Structure formats: structure tokens, C-alpha cells
UniProtKB/Swiss-Prot annotation:
Keywords: Allergen, Disulfide bond, Hydrolase, Protease, Signal, Thiol protease, Zymogen
Source species of the chain: Carica papaya (Papaya)
Lineage, opening ranks: Eukaryota, Viridiplantae, Streptophyta, Embryophyta, Tracheophyta
Notes on temperature effects: Optimum temperature is 50 degrees Celsius. Unstable upon 65 degrees Celsius.
Entire protein: shown range: 134 to 345 of 345
Name of the protein in question: Papain
Its biological purpose: Cysteine proteinase with a high level of diversity in substrate specificity, an amino acid bearing a large hydrophobic side chain at the P2 position is preferred.
pH dependence: Optimum pH is 4.
């Protein structure tokens, strides 16, 4: 795999979003990976609906938190609508998939990266954007403005985001806190520290969609 990957340069990443106060990060993370794999497989970059996953993933807890893997399982089992059809409201409401016409996109399954393995995560990122988790609670992450982030941070993961690239010393992360946070909404997190958790627990739990 190459020394640098940046899915933004391949036109496979949509603009940075702001989830607001709702604990919907798991839905935003999952959508980034759907947006990416559909561009990779079909050539078209579309925005898909975080709100649909928020409303309709019965295994998750709406704005109280959730699971990227169940959100991705939902998209493989049913499908997902365009963001424009099902825009983001920042609050969980009734599942309205059936009232909004046919699904826009569908995937075929979900896979997990082997946890606590930096190389396995980089291998998956070279193939597509990947949903990852990290510890965001610390003020250093909250206040991050730029540069390759080394912490301080623990490994008590609490926030789902998407890995969309990497380089020799970092993994490139698309956050869902708007374009005013970090590097126009992105963070570069240090890699290669030899800690199997990853910096801020980045290697704990990573999933990606499968599309034939």
C-alpha cells in the first residue's frame, strides 16, 4: 500500500458536517463510508442520510448514541436515501424510510477490521474510507486546531468518526463538528507510536461497508 492516501483527492468525500448537540456521530461516521464506497464503485459522489440511520436503526439509541456496525448493517439489509430526501434534523424522529420513495443506494454487507492492528487499518483505508472510533472527551481533542495530534488522550473511546486517508506519521480523520473545528473539520492523528490501542484508542473498533 502507498505512503499517502487521501480520498478527498479522489473525489470520494463530501463536505464536512456538523452533528450538533445530538449524539449521532455513529450515523455520520457510517454515512461517510457509504458516500465513499458508492463513489468508488459507481463513479458518482452523493450525500446520504444520517437522519435515516438516526431514526431507523432500531439497535442504536438515537441521539443517546449508537453503533456504526448496525447502521452499516441496516444499509446492507435495506438501503439508504439521499440526504436531500431525508435531511438532518438533529433530533431522533419516527423512521420515515417507507414514506420517502425507493432507496437511493444499497450495499451488500459489512466487515470489521482486525482490532488493535495499525497495519490492518491502513490496509483497509487504502481500499476505502473506514468507520473508526476514538476518545474525544479530553479538552486537547475538543480544542484541537491543527497539526499532527498526539494527545494527550486516553483510550476510553466515545466518538465515531471516519478515516479517509493516512500518511507516514498520521491517519486522516473526517470529524462531524463542522468546518470551524480542526483543519477545516479534519484531524490528523499520529500513528506509529507502537501502542496497540492507537492514539486516543483509534484502533479499537473499525468497520467498513462491502459493495459488489
Amino acid at each position: 500500500i502507498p505512503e499517502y492516501v487521501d480520498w478527498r483527492q479522489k473525489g470520494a468525500v463530501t463536505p464536512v458536517k456538523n452533528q450538533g448537540s445530538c449524539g449521532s456521530c455513529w450515523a455520520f461516521s457510517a454515512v461517510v463510508t457509504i458516500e465513499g464506497i458508492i463513489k468508488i464503485r459507481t463513479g458518482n459522489l452523493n450525500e446520504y442520510s444520517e437522519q435515516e440511520l438516526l431514526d431507523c436503526d432500531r439497535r442504536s439509541y438515537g441521539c443517546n448514541g449508537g453503533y456504526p456496525w448496525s447502521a452499516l448493517q441496516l444499509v446492507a439489509q435495506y438501503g439508504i436515501h439521499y440526504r436531500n430526501t431525508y435531511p438532518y434534523e438533529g433530533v431522533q424522529r419516527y423512521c420515515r424510510s417507507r414514506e420517502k420513495g425507493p432507496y437511493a443506494a444499497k450495499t451488500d454487507g459489512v466487515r470489521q477490521v482486525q482490532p488493535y492492528n495499525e497495519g490492518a487499518l491502513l490496509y483497509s483505508i487504502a481500499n476505502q474510507p473506514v468507520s473508526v472510533v476514538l476518545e474525544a472527551a479530553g479538552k486537547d481533542f475538543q480544542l484541537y486546531r491543527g497539526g499532527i495530534f498526539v494527545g494527550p488522550c486516553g483510550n476510553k473511546v466515545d466518538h465515531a468518526v471516519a478515516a479517509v486517508g493516512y500518511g507516514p506519521n498520521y491517519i486522516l480523520i473526517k470529524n462531524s463538528w463542522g468546518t470551524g473545528w480542526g483543519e477545516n473539520g479534519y484531524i490528523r492523528i499520529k500513528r506509529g507510536t507502537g501502542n496497540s490501542y492507537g492514539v486516543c484508542g483509534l484502533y479499537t473498533s473499525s468497520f467498513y461497508p462491502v459493495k459488489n
